[PDB]
Homo-oligomer: A and B are copies of this chain.
Amino acid sequence: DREKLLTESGVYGTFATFQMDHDWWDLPGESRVISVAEVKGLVEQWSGKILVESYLLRGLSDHADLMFRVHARTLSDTQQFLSAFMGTRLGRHLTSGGLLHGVSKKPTYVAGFPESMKTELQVNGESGSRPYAIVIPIKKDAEFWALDQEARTALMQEHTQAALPYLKTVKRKLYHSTGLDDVDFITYFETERLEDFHNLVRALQQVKEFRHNRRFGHPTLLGTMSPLDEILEKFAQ
């Protein structure tokens, strides 16, 4: 039910990044192929309860080789899966990178937008395989929360407005992360055109809302989306 998890509300989303130790290559090739096999099996073992997608950060994001985007209706399940993964022979040679959670929620400000804008917001992304993926954690300043509903709705309409020209070439998803870690939002983007995504962020950097981002990125995780087998394959030969 990928359909259900990727779009519904109440679905927790977790982003876990990992980096491979050096002593992993001190292991003989044989030991490594077995290790890869263990993990692929574990992920397949969980495919019933949760969704797991893989990203190659190696060579695009500093100090990170692999990232999982995990959807689940409870974080407990996500915990059980991640603790197991980190337990495997492969997991034991991975230094845990960033770990961020956030629930997907129903839109809060879109209702107060022009009806013509709601129409355009119907489109989310393109039809693409092995797209780039970008993840940007966000913390708002105290000011942002002090604002009243009308004020923020105005800021968001300005945010949305600037982004409309990229509505097709950049898929987007927003996770509400407050209280589960040190950020207010987790933003997630898929795109085949990074030059568009770059322009999309400069455009958003010029709206008013932007200056309220006490934390913007750190880390800004850039990677290529790919099946788990092809990623681990690189660590076996």
Please, what's the 1-or-0 string for A10-41, where 1 marks a CB less than 8 Å from any CB in chain B? 10100010010111010000000000000000
CB <8 Å contact, B59 and A181: no
Q: Given known contacts A75-B194, A182-B219, A201-B179, is B210 in contact with A145 (CB within 8 Å)?
A: yes
Q: Is the CB of A194 within 8 A of B179?
A: yes
User: Is A103 a contact partner of B22 (Cβ separation < 8 A)?
Assistant: no
Q: Mark A190-229, 1 if CB is under 8 A from B, else 0.
A: 0000110110111001101011000011111010100000
The answer to whether A179 and B134 have CB atoms under 8 Å apart is: yes
Across the interface, A222 reaches (CB within 8 A) one of B176, B180, B198, namely B180
In the complex, what residue of chain B is closest to A21 when comparing beta carbons?
B22
Q: Give the interface size bracket for A toward B.
A: 35 or more
Task: Indicate whether A157 reaches chain B with its CB closer than 8 angstroms.
Answer: no
Question: Does A173 sit within 8 A of B, measured CB to CB?
Answer: no
B146 and A198: CB pair below 8 A? no
Q: Is A172 an interface residue (CB 8 A)?
A: no
Contact indicator B60/A101 (Cβ below 8 Å): yes
18 contacts between A and B (CB under 8 A): A10-B195, A25-B87, A56-B83, A59-B80, A59-B83, A59-B99, A60-B75, A60-B78, A61-B99, A62-B96, A62-B97, A75-B222, A76-B224, A101-B222, A134-B179, A146-B211, A178-B201, A180-B198
